[PDB]
Design a protein around this nucleic acid. Structure first.
Ligand code: K
Ligand code: K
Ligand code: MG
Ligand code: MG
Ligand code: MG
Ligand code: MG
Ligand code: MG
Ligand code: MG
Ligand code: MG
Ligand code: MG
Ligand code: MG
Ligand code: MG
Ligand code: MG
Ligand code: MG
Ligand code: MG
Ligand code: MG
Lengths: 107, 56, 46, 179, 74
RNA sequence: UAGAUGUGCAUAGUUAAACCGAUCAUUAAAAUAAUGAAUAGUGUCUAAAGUUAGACCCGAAGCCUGGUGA
RNA sequence: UAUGAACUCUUAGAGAAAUUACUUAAUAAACGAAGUGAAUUGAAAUAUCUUAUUAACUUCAGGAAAAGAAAUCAAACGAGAUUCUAUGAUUAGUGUGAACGAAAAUAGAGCAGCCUAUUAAAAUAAGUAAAAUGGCUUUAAAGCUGUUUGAAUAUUGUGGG
């Protein structure tokens, strides 16, 4: 019976988060035997990581990330308030990576 | 008098370059894809992460 | 002192120099009307 | 300006006013005009001289004439280095006369010619073209060289091949006048 | 000598197409005065501007720019 | 319910200033040698005031900008 | 809650507006943005300065407009678009002086994000960034700009600050 309330928790998240997870779903929430390489979302096919820049294959030019560093910090701050920060892709704004880079390298 | 005005403001569509026509055509195909939907199978897996990070 | 400058004054020059059409048909005359209209004047010209 | 006659085209180089007056030698059905699509960014509200030439982003600028001892300020102007040149157009095949600045002359050599300077789609370039440069852009689009170039670039982008042309419409009026 | 001098233009890069005498052989890349290329060569289709895109299509690099040969003869 | 939140002033002085600190500054090293500087604030009302705004009141000739009139 | 009628001029063209002659001809001001841009005045005179990105004029535009989702600020912690009000602040700072004068941050009014923009737009930006010089702004930076010149390709450290 605890599965009917789990979906209610995912449906209670803000629309700004549900939208992002819908188009950039991590491999963790995908089916058990699913392969991340296949059945990629149309958004994921355009950009595996929306927070990193991508070099267009045809034209040798880097495309800005779909979410700027300012918007990347708003998702990490909004995702950390609902305990879903483990679903966002790699980001320099992650609270862990920000802290790992300091302990590793320091000042 | 209104159709001759809207058609006039849309008269520059014949001066578009092949790239400008290619980008405009991708929006029609992209906008038709819609927004991906989250299966209740995936929502159940998302709730597990929420519950585990709120109550344990 | 003042002079009788309106002696022999014709009403054809009044219409040409201070008439309504001398103003709607000029850039500076549209201001006079708009100015006099904002003040509420009934006599906009001549 | 007084533009040359295009070798094998009845469409003359447009007037700076935007009109395309055809010679009476060309039979045309009455109530017919060649209207150029309006400039997307509209005319330039100041320095109307630039609405009839390739001035780029250069306008007339106002500043101060600063003295040497007391630094007294007096208003002056800074005018762009405008010149009248005859630029070659490969598509048209003639010398298009126009007023162009020395900075826009270097850009012409940088892009590969006048035609390559007018066909640019970047926003920064369409603003530099202006009303006049937008008319030359429209004229070269009617030429067969640019038409076959865009028809070939649509195959590389996976676009379907591409109604009636404006040069044939004028051709249809001369055969219609014979009947 | 000084630390700052008058800024000058060294010319425009162009590739010959008609084997112009006194300048270079056919398909010769070098810098030429902007006036000669703009008024004489380009209208007559004797040369072409070497834009960055032109360098890629021809496979050459920017390090292939030669010099004018005043002693060249057909 | 609980936690946090919202200018400011004072509580420590000293010097050009920091370190320093019931001590501090000058003496090109420092050292009671001398000299100078140390102890209730804060808010409100009433009233008189300093400053900036027309600033207790009335009064120029003139300067600039936009318009009007042969 | 529906409904008949509702003349002439501003307002077809002309002209001495409310006429002519025709016809199912028709849109003020204030506010907004850019451009241009003073002087009285103060400094007990007066040139830099102040007055003042003021008044005014010109263009263009809508019921609002403009602006706007960081090549932004911070300082080794972090904040997270724009707009409006207050504090910060007779502050930092500039200037011989007279005077001029921020931002971070905080509080409140609102709160909305995006490119598949809820109206149809990018194949991620080159004569551009930037430099010298002449000016504007200003604290010398950043930003704006005439003239002459003129780059690079992403945190596997490329570009701006
Ligand atoms: K004085
Ligand atoms: K000060
Ligand atoms: Mg007199
Ligand atoms: Mg008389
Ligand atoms: Mg002009
Ligand atoms: Mg030279
Ligand atoms: Mg103290
Ligand atoms: Mg007389
Ligand atoms: Mg009428
Ligand atoms: Mg009329
Ligand atoms: Mg303030
Ligand atoms: Mg970019
Ligand atoms: Mg610059
Ligand atoms: Mg710097
Ligand atoms: Mg600077
Ligand atoms: Mg910069």
């Amino acid at each position: 019976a605890t599965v009917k309330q789990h979906v209610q928790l995912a449906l209670s998240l803000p629309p700004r988060l549900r939208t992002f997870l819908a188009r950039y779903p991590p491999a963790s929430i995908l089916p058990a035997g699913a392969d991340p390489e296949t059945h990629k979302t149309p958004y994921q096919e355009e950009s595996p990581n929306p927070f990193m820049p991508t070099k267009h294959p045809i034209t040798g030019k880097w495309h800005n990330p779909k979410y700027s560093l300012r918007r990347q910090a708003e998702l990490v701050k909004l995702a950390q308030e609902h305990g879903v920060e483990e679903l966002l892709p790699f980001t320099r704004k992650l609270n862990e990576e920000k802290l790992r880079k300091r302990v590793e390298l320091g000042l | 008098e209104e159709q001759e005005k809207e058609a006039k403001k849309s008269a520059a569509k014949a001066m578009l370059t092949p790239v400008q026509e290619y980008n405009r055509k991708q929006r029609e195909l992209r906008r038709a894809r819609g927004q991906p939907a989250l299966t209740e199978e995936m929502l159940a897996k998302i709730g597990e992460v929420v519950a585990r990070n709120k109550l344990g | 002192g003042p002079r009788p400058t309106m002696s022999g004054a014709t009403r054809l020059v009044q219409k040409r120099r201070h008439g309504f059409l001398s103003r709607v048909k000029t850039k500076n005359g549209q201001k006079t009307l708009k100015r006099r209209l904002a003040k509420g004047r009934l006599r906009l010209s001549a | 300006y007084h533009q040359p006659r295009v070798p094998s085209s009845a469409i003359p180089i447009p007037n700076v006013s935007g009109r395309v007056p055809l010679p009476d030698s060309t039979p045309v059905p009455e109530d017919f005009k060649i209207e150029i699509p309006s400039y997307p960014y509209g005319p330039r509200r100041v320095y109307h001289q630039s609405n009839t030439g390739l001035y780029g982003s250069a306008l007339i600028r106002f500043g101060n004439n600063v003295s040497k001892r007391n630094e007294i300020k007096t208003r002056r102007k800074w005018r762009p280095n405008v010149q009248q040149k005859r630029l070659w157009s490969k598509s048209l095949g003639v010398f298009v006369r126009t007023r162009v600045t020395t900075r826009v002359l270097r850009t012409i050599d940088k892009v590969g010619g006048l035609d390559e300077y007018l066909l640019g789609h970047k926003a920064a370039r369409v603003k530099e073209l202006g009303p006049w440069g937008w008319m030359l852009r429209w004229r070269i689009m009617q030429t067969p060289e640019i038409r076959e170039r865009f028809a070939k670039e649509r195959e590389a982008l996976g676009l379907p091949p591409r109604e009636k042309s404006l040069e044939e419409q004028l051709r249809e009026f001369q055969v219609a006048g014979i009947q | 000598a000084s630390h700052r001098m008058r800024l000058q233009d060294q010319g425009v890069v162009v590739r010959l197409l008609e084997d112009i005498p006194k300048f270079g052989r056919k398909h010769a890349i070098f810098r030429i005065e902007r006036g000669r290329m703009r008024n004489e060569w380009f209208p007559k289709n004797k040369a072409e501007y070497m834009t960055p895109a032109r360098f890629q299509e021809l496979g050459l690099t920017r390090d292939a720019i030669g010099e004018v040969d005043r002693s060249f003869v057909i």
